[PDB]
Every structure is written in structure tokens, then in C-alpha cells.
């Protein structure tokens, strides 16, 4: 389990699959960008209960949501589609698995676009994100 400090400051989430930071855009898009100075990659993780987080784009003021067809979008309201199991894997990257659609992961393709839920799964580079300082 992650300590209280994990939740005290914003983070960038760096994806192993292409080196994209996860971006939540004010325009509702969720995608990846390599540029570390992009304003929309500063994210706030919030614990909903032990091991479960919501992921909010600070500048966008929107929360990451995974829909029933597996799309990612950024939602103005917190709904049950906005909660993810946060787990540290053995390679020291984390995964974020939907608490609602429990086989599917937050993921980015090598193109930078999100990867649809039904195409995700354990062991893929697409699902691995490293939290780091947002400074």
C-alpha cells in the first residue's frame, strides 16, 4: 500500500509504453504526451478507500473515467466509473484497474491514444504508469 504522502502533492504519471505522460485535457480528452512541461499532465490522486483512487486533471478540473465500452474520458462529476484499484507491480510501475469494469486497465497505446478497456490486460506495457513529482 502507498503511504499518505502519495496523496499530498500532485503527480505526473509516466507510461512505459512510449514514454507518454497521462494527460487529462480541459476539452475532455484523455491521452498521452511526451512533453513534461505540458500543463495538463499534472494530476491529483485521491484515495476513495484503501487501494482505490480517483485521478483528477488539476488544470482540466475533470476526473478520469472509464466507460462501459472501454473509452477513457475526463468527467466533470465524480461517478462510479472514476475509481481505480492502484497497485504497485514488481517492475516498480503501477497499474490502475477499473473498480467497475474489473478486467480493464487505464492504458495508453504506443501512438499516444488511450487503449480501449477490452484490449488491455496484465503484462502489457500499455497499462504501466510511474507516478512522479509534478514540480
Author numbering: 20 to 154
What does the paper say about this structure?
Based on the calculation by in silico predictions, two FGF2 mutants with four-point mutations (FGF2-M1 with D28E/C78L/C96I/S137P and FGF2-M2 with D28E/C78I/C96I/S137P) were finally designed. We successfully solved the high-resolution (1.40 Å and 1.48 Å, respectively) crystal structures of FGF2-M1 and the FGF2-M2/SOS complex. On the other hand, SOS was used as an additive reagent to promote the crystallization of FGF2-M2 because it binds to the heparin-binding site of FGF2. In the crystal structure of the FGF2-M2/SOS complex, negatively charged SOS was bound to the positively charged HSPG-binding site harboring K128, R129, K134, and K138 through extensive electrostatic interactions. The RMSD value between the structures of the FGF2 mutants was 0.144 Å for all Cα atoms, indicating that the introduction of mutations did not affect the overall structure of FGF2. Both of them adopted the canonical β-trefoil fold, in which two sets of three β-hairpins are arranged with a pseudo-three-fold symmetry. The structures of FGF2-M1 and FGF2-M2 showed that leucine or isoleucine at position 78 were sandwiched by hydrophobic interactions consisting of P45, P58, H59, and L77. Thus, C78L and C78I seem to allow for better interactions with neighboring residues, which prefer a bit more hydrophobic and a bit larger amino acid; the hydropathy scales of leucine and isoleucine are 3.8 and 4.5, respectively, with their volumes of 166.7 Å3. The C96I mutation formed a van der Waals interaction with the methyl group of T98 at a distance ranging from 4.1 Å to 4.7 Å. The introduction of isoleucine at position 96 in the FGF2 mutants likely dictates the orientation of the T98 side-chain. Subsequently, the S137P mutation demonstrated an improvement in FGF2’s thermo-stability, as determined by SDS-PAGE and CD experiments. It was also identified through the crystal structures of FGF2-M1 and FGF2-M2; the substituted proline residue at position 137 forms CH-π interactions with W123 to stabilize the β10–β11 hairpin, a portion of the heparin-binding site of FGF2.
